[PDB]
Structure 1
């Protein structure tokens, strides 16, 4: 009941964390897409 009077506040904190988590997911996807190679040779035992 005491928290309810504050109105917006907890919502703003939750929204900011949600946005940061989405940004981290976007960063992981971009880095891994660049990491992937269009053509690769299959790994075999005794490779190299």
Structure 2
């Protein structure tokens, strides 16, 4: 099967970036939605608002 993959290795080669591109995209998606502020803010101990 691998000896016959050298004619379709390129097809195996492009699907990797198509999978790598989506994989790095979803990793970047969480950064764009949740990582807006660089400073982590602690909740105050006083709950009387």
TM-score relative to the length of structure 2: 0.62
Query: Which runs of at least 4 in structure 1 moved beyond 6 Å after TM superposition?
Result: 35-38
Unaligned runs of 5+ in 1: none
Task: Name the residue aligned to 1:17.
Answer: 19
Task: Name the residue aligned to 2:32.
Answer: 30
Shift, 1:43, TM fit? 5.9
Task: Give runs of aligned pairs for residues 35-46 of structure 1, distance below 5 A.
Answer: 39-42=41-44
Q: C-alpha separation between the residues in 2 aligned to 1:21 and 1:28? A: 12
Query: Structure 1 34/2 Cα, relative in aligned 2: closer, same or farther at 3 Å?
Result: same
Shift, 1:15, TM fit? 1.0
Q: Considering fraction of residues, name the structure with more helix.
A: 1
Count of residues paired in the alignment = 47
